[PDB]
Amino acid sequence: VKNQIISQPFPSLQLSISLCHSSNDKDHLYVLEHNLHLLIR
Amino acid sequence: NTASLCRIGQETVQDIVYRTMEIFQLLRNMQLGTYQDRLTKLQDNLRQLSVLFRKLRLVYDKCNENDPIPVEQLIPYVESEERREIAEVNKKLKQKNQQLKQIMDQLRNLIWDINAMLAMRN
Amino acid sequence: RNQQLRTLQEECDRKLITLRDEISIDLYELEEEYYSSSS
Amino acid sequence: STLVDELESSFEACFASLVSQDQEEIRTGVDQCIQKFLDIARQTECFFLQKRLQLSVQKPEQVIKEDVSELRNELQRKDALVQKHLTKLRHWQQVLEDI
């Protein structure tokens, strides 16, 4: 929609990806977030 | 105190067998500096085997005198405070085991995370 | 600047690897100790 | 009656051909000596199990005492090992904090 990605790998697995920012305001897996930067670099 | 003696005698029987096998293996390993070292090791093993035989004899002599009821009679076919005290140790031990489970699953998650993060640092 | 940054990175990597090995050893001992009890 | 005596008799007979004052004879001798030794050991095993079963079915109190002893001992084992893990954990925590 705007800042979320929603996905269904398995019929009982929902993962969500979200960009969070602070010029835009009016339980997590650290490994995947760390790996994301290395993929893009 | 007597069942423990029977278990000890059994265990000493297995150690006697194992020591005999180890003696034969050590005699096999001898090939004509270190020869005196092997000889001293052989003497030590033989003397501790003799001590083990003496201990087995002592256990057998102690347990022989202390059968009124024969075997094949107590097999069940188709046709007081000790319990109270035991339970607490079981529950306490079970509780301790449960606690160890929490630490173990936590440490394994930590090692999984470090493996996953370190695998792709290149 | 490049040389200094690479040296710092190498030190951090070494520390993490040694920590992982130590934790694995203990982790191995803990499983064995726990998995062989009558509960 | 005194099975241990012929136990060591067979044990010493296993060494008979060595301490004395071309392969078939020694192989046969060691075969019979070794099979006799194993048989005597298994018979002693059987006697201990029969006695243990009789004692356990007659009075379980001694069995209970042994159970108490083993459970206490393993309790101390667990406590000591978890203490060792904590000490090393503090050590590496400070080592990694020195960065």
Swiss-Prot record, chain A:
Ubiquitous. It is found in: Nucleus. Belongs to the Mediator complex subunit 17 family. It is linked to Microcephaly, postnatal progressive, with seizures and brain atrophy: A disorder characterized by postnatal progressive microcephaly and severe developmental retardation associated with cerebral and cerebellar atrophy. Infants manifest swallowing difficulties leading to failure to thrive, jitteriness, poor visual fixation, truncal arching, seizures. There is no acquisition of developmental milestones and patients suffer from marked spasticity and profound retardation. Progressive microcephaly becomes evident few months after birth. Component of the Mediator complex, a coactivator involved in the regulated transcription of nearly all RNA polymerase II-dependent genes. Mediator functions as a bridge to convey information from gene-specific regulatory proteins to the basal RNA polymerase II transcription machinery. Mediator is recruited to promoters by direct interactions with regulatory proteins and serves as a scaffold for the assembly of a functional preinitiation complex with RNA polymerase II and the general transcription factors. This is Mediator of RNA polymerase II transcription subunit 17. The gene is MED17. The chain holds residues 327 to 380 of 651 of the full protein.
Curated annotation (Swiss-Prot), chain B:
GO terms for biological process: positive regulation of DNA-templated transcription; positive regulation of transcription elongation by RNA polymerase II; positive regulation of transcription initiation by RNA polymerase II; protein ubiquitination; RNA polymerase II preinitiation complex assembly; somatic stem cell population maintenance. Expressed in brain, heart, kidney, liver, lung, pancreas, placenta and skeletal muscle. It comes from the Eukaryota. Keywords: Acetylation, Activator, Coiled coil, Nucleus, Transcription, Transcription regulation. GO terms for molecular function: nuclear thyroid hormone receptor binding; nuclear vitamin D receptor binding; transcription coactivator activity; transcription coregulator activity; ubiquitin protein ligase activity. Its main location: nucleus. Residues 34-58, 80-117 form a coiled coil. One of its GO terms (cellular component) is nucleoplasm. Component of the Mediator complex, a coactivator involved in the regulated transcription of nearly all RNA polymerase II-dependent genes. Mediator functions as a bridge to convey information from gene-specific regulatory proteins to the basal RNA polymerase II transcription machinery. Mediator is recruited to promoters by direct interactions with regulatory proteins and serves as a scaffold for the assembly of a functional preinitiation complex with RNA polymerase II and the general transcription factors. The gene is MED30.
Curated annotation (Swiss-Prot), chain C:
It is found in: Nucleus. It comes from the Eukaryota. Residues 1-22 form a coiled coil. Component of the Mediator complex, which is composed of MED1, MED4, MED6, MED7, MED8, MED9, MED10, MED11, MED12, MED13, MED13L, MED14, MED15, MED16, MED17, MED18, MED19, MED20, MED21, MED22, MED23, MED24, MED25, MED26, MED27, MED29, MED30, MED31, CCNC, CDK8 and CDC2L6/CDK11. The MED12, MED13, CCNC and CDK8 subunits form a distinct module termed the CDK8 module. Mediator containing the CDK8 module is less active than Mediator lacking this module in supporting transcriptional activation. Component of the Mediator complex, a coactivator involved in the regulated transcription of nearly all RNA polymerase II-dependent genes. Mediator functions as a bridge to convey information from gene-specific regulatory proteins to the basal RNA polymerase II transcription machinery. Mediator is recruited to promoters by direct interactions with regulatory proteins and serves as a scaffold for the assembly of a functional preinitiation complex with RNA polymerase II and the general transcription factors. Belongs to the Mediator complex subunit 22 family. This is Mediator of RNA polymerase II transcription subunit 22. The gene is MED22.
UniProtKB/Swiss-Prot annotation, chain D:
Keywords: Actin-binding, Activator, Coiled coil, Cytoplasm, Membrane, Nucleus, Transcription, Transcription regulation. GO terms for biological process: negative regulation of smooth muscle cell differentiation; positive regulation of transcription elongation by RNA polymerase II; positive regulation of transcription initiation by RNA polymerase II; RNA polymerase II preinitiation complex assembly; somatic stem cell population maintenance. Induction: Up-regulated by endothelial cells when exposed to tumor conditional media. One of its GO terms (cellular component) is mediator complex. Its main location: nucleus. Residues 62-98 form a coiled coil. It is a peripheral membrane protein. It comes from the Eukaryota. Widely expressed. Highly expressed in vascular tissues such as placenta, testis and liver. GO terms for molecular function: actin binding. It is found in: Nucleus; Cytoplasm; Membrane. Component of the Mediator complex, which is composed of MED1, MED4, MED6, MED7, MED8, MED9, MED10, MED11, MED12, MED13, MED13L, MED14, MED15, MED16, MED17, MED18, MED19, MED20, MED21, MED22, MED23, MED24, MED25, MED26, MED27, MED29, MED30, MED31, CCNC, CDK8 and CDC2L6/CDK11. The MED12, MED13, CCNC and CDK8 subunits form a distinct module termed the CDK8 module. Mediator containing the CDK8 module is less active than Mediator lacking this module in supporting transcriptional activation. Belongs to the Mediator complex subunit 28 family. The chain holds residues 42 to 146 of 178 of the full protein.
